[PDB]
Amino acid sequence: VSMMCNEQAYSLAVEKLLNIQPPPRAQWIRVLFGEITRLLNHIMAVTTHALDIGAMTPFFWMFEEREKMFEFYERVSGARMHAAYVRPGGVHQDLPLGLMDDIYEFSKNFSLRIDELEEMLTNNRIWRNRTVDIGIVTAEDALNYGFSGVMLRGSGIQWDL
Amino acid sequence: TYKYVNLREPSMDMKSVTDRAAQTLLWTELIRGLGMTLSYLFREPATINYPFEKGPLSPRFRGEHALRRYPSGEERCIACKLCEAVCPAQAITIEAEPRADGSRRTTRYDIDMTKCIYCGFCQEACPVDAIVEGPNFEFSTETHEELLYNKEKLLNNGDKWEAEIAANIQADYLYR
Amino acid sequence: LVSDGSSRPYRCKIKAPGFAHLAGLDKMSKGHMLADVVAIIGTQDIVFGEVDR
Amino acid sequence: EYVVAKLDDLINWARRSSLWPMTFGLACCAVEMMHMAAPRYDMDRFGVVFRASPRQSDVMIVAGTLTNKMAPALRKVYDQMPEPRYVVSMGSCANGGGYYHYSYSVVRGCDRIVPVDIYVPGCPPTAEALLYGILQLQKKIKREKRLRIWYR
Amino acid sequence: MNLMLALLTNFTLATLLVIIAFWLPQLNVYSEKTSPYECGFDPMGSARLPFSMKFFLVAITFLLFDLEIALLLPLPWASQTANLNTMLTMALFLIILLAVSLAYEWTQKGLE
Amino acid sequence: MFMINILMLIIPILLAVAFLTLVERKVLGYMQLRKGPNVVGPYGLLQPIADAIKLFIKEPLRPATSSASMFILAPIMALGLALTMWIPLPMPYPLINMNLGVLFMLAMSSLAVYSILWSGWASNSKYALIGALRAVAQTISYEVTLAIILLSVLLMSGSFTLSTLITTQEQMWLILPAWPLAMMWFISTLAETNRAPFDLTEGESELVSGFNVEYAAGPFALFFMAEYANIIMMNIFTAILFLGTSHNPHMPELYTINFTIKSLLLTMSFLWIRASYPRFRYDQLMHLLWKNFLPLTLALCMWHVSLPILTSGIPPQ
Amino acid sequence: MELLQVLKRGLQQVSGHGGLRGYLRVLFRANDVRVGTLVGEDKYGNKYY
Ligand SMILES: CCCCCCCCCCCCCCCCCC(=O)OC[C@H](COP(=O)(O)OCCN)OC(=O)CCCCCCCCCCCCCCCCC
Ligand SMILES: CCCCCCCCCCCCCCCCCC(=O)OC[C@H](COP(=O)(O)OCCN)OC(=O)CCCCCCCCCCCCCCCCC
Ligand code: SF4
Ligand code: SF4
């Protein structure tokens, strides 16, 4: 489900070997995508989790909204999910005339959609009863196991790369 | 920096316990919570009615293959052997021969439609601008013996439209 | 990513989660029910093919 | 006659009015099927309800990628399905295996295990060329069981 | 005399539709591979049914709470009566006699 | 023409369980922002007559490692008591005038769990062997949550017949003087008849619903069928008990019109709950019966004993 | 009083589009029943609205 988050850690691992930095516009594209796949990997982890538990709608309530955002891959790279876009020298090609009147219309109206899950799940009682004090691994055996982030910092140790 | 979430004690006085004991016992949550947030059914449903309506796409879309040709025909390919050297999946299979007129062309040209991983690496390696990922997802044949493509499928499949393709490339060659 | 010096690379070892996040389930699961176990796994956000690390 | 061959204008219509798909979501073509159950190109209520149990399903949909360690667990599940069963493979890895066609640990094609009806090509097919895939499967049902007992 | 022909209709319509599904349209003499399959979506279960203590006490506890609701059952018939100080103070006894049987067992239930 | 009345009640209700499966998903669809069955109907309305014939064509296998006389006897007792319970029920006139028939509901609602104990045993192993044993265990515990607060209104009704249950509510709509009992009346039938928040019978991610898990669409076609016959019958039983309508002898036509409109509304709630709430994780399911549901039910029981006495308001019988 | 406040628009929309025959002829393929605003020209008789 991470599309541009992978190839961000391959291109950056080959630029080091080449002694080449990417140019300045090629860095503010990678962040606008590398921080828009973090609104896709976190839609899935908070919905399919809550479908295994058994809540039906926030799966459907978010994927109906999610299809406004697989639109944005197609307009820039060419394709639906797996885009071969990032290269070891920056972005392949330029994004079309647009996408700044269409990300802006989108991203000014996403904080209401995330204001629905707060009322579905957080102050809900049954889901709080399904999830409190469950799977408490918190020790320095929760770092001896070599964990990366969350299931770290969500339990104690503040650190991220 | 920081932010602390779910780090707050209850008030634990005489007033706000009745505010919480009205919650557990007489359900001021769970009806105001989700007897109202759900219904909210009164929006218009967003369903693409598929055999008639179809969904939006973009002029750089990837799909069925094609081989263009010039104004009055020349079979734009020149068998220069690059679209086969950067297929990552080794789908293309070209075998040229000096054609009798003197200009070199293909004899056999084979694209599997199953090993085709749909890069866009054939589309951009070509110097003479021939092989183009054409914008039609119409597929779904019933035999594995069929999805192997020859040369003389692709031309037929590449001259069923060129009003479709040449409207796309003229819009998008200015970036690449 | 060990590179030898020519166009084709040498070994390319991937590190991904699922090695850490799922070796530490056997510690995490003991004591609780069976219907707690399906509640555990969703929070690690396990995506397979990435356990191909 | 006109009496018997009229009856397969109902049974071969009842068999194509509600398919119940099992799916094998294994790899990336799982997610691009889940958007079809998402209400944009809404899969259900165009005839075909979604995922069920292996005892009750008509038409299974293979996706993803079949390795060696899933090859017996497929064929076992294919056995339990009833007599009017159909197999659709989506994805370009259940057609001859995408890439990983040349690596050691892949069953090279998924037709080598089961007989599969409609092949749908594309790394992930866009849930748009999959409704066109199943609307090819309903057009396949023009067969009759009448004029078989009534001919021979 | 219809009570008793109010249900023997309902059961002979019930057993009708099951044999026109289990029998008739069925008879699977063709290939019908009944091999080692059909094992309820699994394999061979060489273990038998093991005892589970926390799922036995749920059976007995219900049975002893089920009896004295039948003592408690003729309370609406115990309304149109004679002497009613007796009728009230005895009706309150059984409920408390049911309530104490909670509180003793309530100090040890287990993961039920 | 008594025999023509019985068939006039079994047949028009098999449509109302077949035309509920269609409204099962249209109502559950507009909550997801999507249309109903769009293409086959025209509006959907012809879906279940096509979706019924497919089941009786598709091959009804029996499992090889199964028993014989038990596996094909539980669907006999499934539709038996699912349809026999519709008899003593006034609308406005019942088919049968039982002297005491409110108790006969529990005489019919008790034996339904004795088929689940069969079918979980009769076929096969662990996905319905132990996985159905803990489905009998939840359904037995919600009678003592049920039978008490069913008795807790009869101290105010007066007797056991159902004609008095419409007479006593000519001016009240009795949900008001007993609204704490009316809450736990709902959740009991929401969990006894094996529905969406307290599930493990049908099965979400539990016994992968191992109480059906094995029936191919021959015998399976009733289980679902029969089961959907309980859920519109506790709704027709709640609305004759709490939310009672008005009866006029000169006009019995206007009874049923104002009556079937009400049982349909409560039937919507079993659909409207499922699209909100997650499951209960079998411990917390039974952890709230004893500890939490039950001691209040005795508390109001002792309340409804004394209050007809210390009001001097004894109901007449 | 929205039972006639907005049905008045739908009365000309439902009924007066092709009479009695032209309405149910498009209803039997799907619930695509709304008459579109504009027309296409191409090609055969299939006016892509
Ligand atoms: C697999 C197929 C083979 C099996 C097929 C047979 C299956 C039958 C299963 C049906 C089980 C239903 C048994 C329910 C018994 C309760 C009947 C009852 O109590 O009726 C109420 C009524 C009480 O009398 P009352 O209300 O005072 O009448 C008014 C007078 N003014 O009472 C009356 O109105 C009349 C009482 C006498 C009526 C005849 C006796 C009723 C029972 C006859 C069937 C015997 C039970 C069979 C064994 C049951 C097995 C489950
Ligand atoms: C002095 C004069 C006399 C005084 C009279 C006073 C009258 C007072 C009446 C009070 C008694 C009636 C209320 C019934 C009690 C409520 C049931 C209950 O106790 O639930 C407790 C349950 C336990 O969980 P909790 O304690 O909150 O701990 C977890 C917190 N993390 O926590 C819960 O909240 C669980 C909630 C219910 C669980 C099921 C939810 C599933 C959805 C059900 C929706 C039902 C909606 C309404 C039903 C239909 C109504 C018509
Ligand atoms: S399209 Fe280009 S790369 Fe492909 S065969 Fe022709 S000349 Fe060679
Ligand atoms: S799309 Fe990519 S993999 Fe497929 S034929 Fe073209 S270059 Fe080869």
Ligand code: SF4
């Ligand atoms: S090759 Fe196609 S089917 Fe295989 S994982 Fe990738 S997208 Fe999915």
